[PDB]
Design a protein around this nucleic acid. Structure first.
Ligand SMILES: [K+]
Ligand SMILES: [K+]
Ligand SMILES: [Mg+2]
Ligand SMILES: [Mg+2]
Ligand SMILES: [Mg+2]
Ligand SMILES: [Mg+2]
Ligand SMILES: [Mg+2]
Ligand SMILES: [Mg+2]
Ligand SMILES: [Mg+2]
Ligand SMILES: [Mg+2]
Ligand SMILES: [Mg+2]
Ligand SMILES: [Mg+2]
Ligand SMILES: [Mg+2]
Ligand SMILES: [Mg+2]
Ligand SMILES: [Mg+2]
Ligand SMILES: [Mg+2]
Ligand SMILES: [Mg+2]
Ligand SMILES: [Mg+2]
Lengths: 80, 91, 208, 132, 325
RNA sequence: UUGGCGGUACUUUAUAUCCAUCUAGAGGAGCCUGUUCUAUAAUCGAUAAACCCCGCUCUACCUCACCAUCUCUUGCUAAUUCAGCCUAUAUACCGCCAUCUUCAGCAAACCCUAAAAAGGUAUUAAAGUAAGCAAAAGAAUCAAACAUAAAAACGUUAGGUCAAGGUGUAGCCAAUGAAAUGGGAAGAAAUGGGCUACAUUUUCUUAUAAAAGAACAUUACUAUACCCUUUAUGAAACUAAAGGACUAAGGAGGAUUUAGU
């Protein structure tokens, strides 16, 4: 949530201006007030960032897969 | 820049000496941690000093051979002509 | 200029090109290979491989030319050299065997040693500091030192000569007098140097 | 600043045709000549008379087709024939153009004692090269 | 509230129709010019259009053209998202999806080479593609800083151990350099009725033009315009200029030249002959010597010519006196 | 807060340019020419840089718009209580230009700011973005390059031009309009620009700029002035050219200043 000059990333305010929800990792030096779903945690360590990336990737693929299955079941019921 | 004594020959030797140790001098400062990232160093002689020395070398080598209206700011002459010319018209 | 900055000045030295490859320094050897992929300026109309071409004398000719009259200026230089050769031959024939040895009869060698006797080591630059004109002793480059000697010669002859004397007769009489360190052009050099000693302490004003 | 035949810049809302957009220094480079005769070629006579006739022929067509000309006319002289090529807007009814063509040809043929023909290409509206 | 004509972006159906009209145009243009439609080509089209619509406009972009729509219509980046609105490329929201997609690939290649672990001059006489060329490859516009960073990353790739896949990759971004041949073109060697060998070449200095006819065997007899060279050129400097070509190659008294110089003054005519003789004399000298001549100024035409006068000033550069105030 | 200024500092700098460097000139002499002044019965306009051989690639009549005298009153056109007006205002304008300028900016649509009078950049990038005009590119100087031209936005100087033409407002209509005839002078006084000479790298002659023979300070160099003849144009010579004499001044030009890469 911080840029390379240790200031809030411009997209935090600009996503609030456009009313876009934001899920952000927020370390002790960050400002979570405008983050819709703040996740307090380490943002600097490679092992911490790699864990979060896997979680967001597994989660998104599960949700996309569930939609495919949900449509097939409901779609199949329409003829059946 | 480094202070340069009058003697040109000694300055030339001093210039070479300092320049050789430029790398080591940088290491000494970088090692002590006074300045973390020091760039390459140069030693230069003030051009003013060099010229003054050269103007003395050439001078020794050189051989000297065997042993009114415009003052005030008004062109009184021109003004007189302007007046005399007017007087010619008057008369 | 109609030449782009990528053009190279031509090299018109006959011996340089015909030297054995091993006789050339690798720096010169490298330049020749590079020049094969570059553009070369056309040689000047007066640039030739002639063995009798002297750059110093050719330059002195151009400094006498008026209004592009090269034929006249070259003729004046040719008449001068001859007037100097004929003046030394007369002296040589009318001199004893001992004196004959010293006498120099080469006009090209009298010209070069004459000019060098007139060149000044130091010059003056006019400077206006605080609304007053001061001239500060300067050290002259090799180009400025050579120009002044030729300029001083071409100006003594053009002006300070009788009305009916001719330039080949005044210039010949001056090259030979400078060749012996007695002429008025040498006197101009002595005055320039003597003034520099007067302004010795005013060199500080230099900013360039 | 040079002002000759230069349509100046405003705020990007001024339509200009290809002919208007190009300044005089583009003549013979990007745009050609509106009149083509042999009177300005080397060793040729009667330039003044061809130039005077063109000036009149342009004022005549402007008045005879008021508001119906999309662009400047093109004059083409071959032998004693004159040919006028004008881009004209589709404002007037079709039969009115047939009247003005018959009238303008006969009148200009009996005025300059040459065969004059009118060539009209109708456009839906003025063609805009660029907005300046 | 700005009211100017918007970009008339060209859809695929539009360009497709522009290609059908062109295909029907070729069949008509072929029928007009009496050629066979099957074999009619782009080169024939340009020739036919130039005959049927003669234009003498100096700029050739302004001349009539009947080109295939691909050449004329600027190829435009297509829609970057579908009907549902989801961008097609994962880097769409960067604004430079194609520049950053390429910088993603080269940075991933660099990482695998560095993790996994000879001379790097596999290609020589090559240059990196210029910014204009890169922009075309990516079909987008780049800044100077964007180009500089792409090269620094590509250089790092070459430094590292490179399998044949990397070398082919960097190759796509290398443009072959053509080193212009700055070497003289030797003239032919014709033969006379007598059977003597001779070469001919022209030369131009200022407004003077010369046509020399050097002969392989001679005693040094130079004749200018059917006259001797001492008579034609009474000035020493002009004769010295004729001596320079032969003297340089130590070939004095070995050739017989017949010259024909028309135009210019005395100095311009000698200079024009000098170049004409040097170019004709090339046929009778070794290639090492021909390069020796080129590097001495003997084979370069002099481009210095009189400049035009400008209205409002005394001379070509001389300005009228700035009047006193 | 913006701009303008600073006898406030600290860095870049100009490319025939601020200093230095280089060449030939102006500033002195005689003429040609413009302007100012004087002045005339007798145009107008331009008139620091950006006027001053400028509108004129051009004034003996004409041109002409000026002055004096005489004359005309539906007075160029198809029609018109109309024709005509070089009458005032370039501080109403179009048209066509000068200037900073071959300077790098101008304008418009958006976006952002704990409010914004304004401002909006960091590239290992932090709020700016996507298009037009200028520049660039391209074309021209008939290969190629370079160079030269051309090009140069928006503004600045109420810059120049109502006398190129046109035109807004105001004015004249037996006159501020139209036509004829004769005149439109003068300096020698200041100043701008140019031409010529002051000579020997010169002067005259033949050639041709090569070479040679003469000349070379009291009238040698040296008037495109005045004057005197002849010729050309014209109806008119007052104009131009070509000769002839006659000679004057000029002996390389103070401060200062122009141009050239
Ligand atoms: K105006
Ligand atoms: K005067
Ligand atoms: Mg952290
Ligand atoms: Mg000149
Ligand atoms: Mg200057
Ligand atoms: Mg004078
Ligand atoms: Mg005025
Ligand atoms: Mg008159
Ligand atoms: Mg009259
Ligand atoms: Mg009147
Ligand atoms: Mg004005
Ligand atoms: Mg341009
Ligand atoms: Mg005004
Ligand atoms: Mg009027
Ligand atoms: Mg007026
Ligand atoms: Mg001669
Ligand atoms: Mg005389
Ligand atoms: Mg007569």
């Amino acid at each position: 949530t911080l840029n390379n000059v240790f200031e809030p990333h411009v997209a935090v305010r600009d996503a609030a201006k456009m009313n876009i929800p934001t899920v952000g990792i927020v370390d002790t030096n960050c400002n979570p007030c405008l983050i819709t779903y703040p996740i307090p945690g380490n943002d600097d360590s490679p092992q911490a960032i790699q864990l979060f990336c896997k979680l967001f990737r597994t989660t998104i693929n599960r949700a996309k897969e569930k939609r495919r299955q949900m449509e097939a079941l409901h779609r199949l019921q329409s003829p059946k | 820049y480094w202070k340069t004594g009058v003697s040109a020959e000694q300055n030339k030797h001093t210039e070479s000496v300092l320049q050789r140790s430029a790398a080591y001098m940088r290491h000494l400062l970088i090692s002590q941690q006074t300045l973390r990232n020091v760039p390459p160093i140069v030693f230069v002689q003030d051009k003013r000093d060099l010229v003054l020395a050269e103007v003395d070398r050439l001078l020794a080598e050189a051989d000297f051979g065997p042993p009114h209206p415009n003052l005030c700011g008004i062109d009184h002459e021109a003004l007189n002509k302007q007046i005399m010319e007017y007087k010619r018209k008057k008369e | 200029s109609r030449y782009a900055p990528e053009f190279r000045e031509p090299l018109i030295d006959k011996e340089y090109y015909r030297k054995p490859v091993a006789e050339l320094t690798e720096e010169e050897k490298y330049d020749q290979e590079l020049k094969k992929t570059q553009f070369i300026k056309a040689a000047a109309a007066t640039e030739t491989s002639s063995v009798f071409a002297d750059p110093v004398i050719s330059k002195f000719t151009n400094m006498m030319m008026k209004g592009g009259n090269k034929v006249l200026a070259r003729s004046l230089m040719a008449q001068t050299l001859e007037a100097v050769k004929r003046k030394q031959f007369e002296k040589y024939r009318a001199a004893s065997a001992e004196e004959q040895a010293t006498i120099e009869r080469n006009p090209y060698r009298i010209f070069h040693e004459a000019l060098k006797n007139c060149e000044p080591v130091i010059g003056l630059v006019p400077i206006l500091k605080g609304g007053h004109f001061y001239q500060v002793p300067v050290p002259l480059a090799d180009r400025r030192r050579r120009f002044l000697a030729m300029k001083w010669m071409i100006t003594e002859c053009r002006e300070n000569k009788p009305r009916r004397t001719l330039m080949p007769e005044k210039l010949s009489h001056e090259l030979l007098e400078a060749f012996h360190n007695r002429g008025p052009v040498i006197k101009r050099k002595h005055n320039m140097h003597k003034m520099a000693e007067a302004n010795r302490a005013l060199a500080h004003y230099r900013w360039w | 600043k040079n002002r000759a035949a230069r349509v100046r810049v405003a705020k990007g809302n001024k339509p200009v045709s290809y002919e208007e957009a190009h300044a005089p220094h583009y003549i013979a480079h990007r745009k050609g000549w509106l009149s083509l005769h042999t009177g300005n070629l080397d060793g040729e006579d009667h330039a003044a008379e061809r130039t005077l006739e063109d000036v009149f022929l342009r004022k005549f067509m402007m008045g005879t087709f008021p508001g119906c000309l999309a662009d400047q006319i093109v004059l083409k002289r071959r032998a004693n024939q004159v040919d006028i090529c004008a881009l004209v807007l589709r404002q007037l009814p079709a039969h009115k153009f047939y009247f003005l063509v018959g009238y303008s040809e006969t009148l200009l043929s009996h005025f300059y004692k040459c065969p004059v023909r009118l060539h009209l290409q109708t456009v839906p509206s003025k063609v805009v090269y660029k907005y300046i | 509230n700005v009211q100017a004509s918007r970009q008339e972006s060209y859809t695929e159906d539009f360009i497709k129709k522009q290609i059908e009209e062109f295909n029907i145009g070729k069949r008509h243009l072929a029928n007009m010019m009496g050629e066979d439609p099957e074999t009619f080509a782009e080169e024939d089209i340009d020739r036919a259009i130039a005959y049927l619509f003669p234009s003498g406009l100096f700029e050739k972009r302004a001349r009539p053209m009947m080109k295939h729509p691909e050449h004329i219509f600027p190829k435009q980046r297509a829609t970057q998202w579908g009907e549902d609105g989801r961008p097609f490329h994962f880097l769409f929201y960067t604004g430079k999806q194609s520049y950053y997609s390429l910088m993603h690939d080269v940075y991933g290649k660099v990482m695998q080479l560095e993790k996994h672990r000879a001379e790097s001059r596999d290609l020589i006489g090559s240059r990196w593609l210029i910014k204009e060329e890169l922009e075309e490859m990516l079909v987008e516009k780049l800044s100077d800083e964007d180009y500089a960073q792409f090269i620094r990353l590509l250089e790092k790739l070459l430094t590292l151990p490179c399998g044949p896949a990397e070398e082919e990759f960097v190759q796509r971004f290398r443009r072959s350099v053509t080193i212009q041949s700055k070497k003289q073109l030797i003239e032919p060697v014709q033969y006379d009725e007598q059977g003597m060998a001779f070469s001919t070449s022209e030369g131009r200095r200022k407004s003077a033009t010369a046509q020399a006819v050097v002969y392989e065997h001679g005693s040094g007899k130079i004749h200018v315009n059917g006259v001797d060279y001492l008579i034609y050129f009474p000035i020493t400097q002009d004769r010295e200029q004729l001596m320079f070509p032969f003297h340089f190659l130590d070939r004095l008294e070995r050739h017989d030249v017949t010259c024909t110089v028309s135009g210019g003054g005395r100095s311009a005519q000698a200079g024009a002959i000098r170049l004409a003789m040097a170019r004709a004399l090339c046929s009778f000298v070794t290639e090492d010597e021909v390069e020796w001549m080129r590097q001495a100024g003997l084979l370069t035409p002099d481009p210095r010519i009189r400049e035009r006068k400008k209205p409002g000033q005394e001379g070509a550069r001389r300005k009228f006196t700035w009047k006193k105030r």
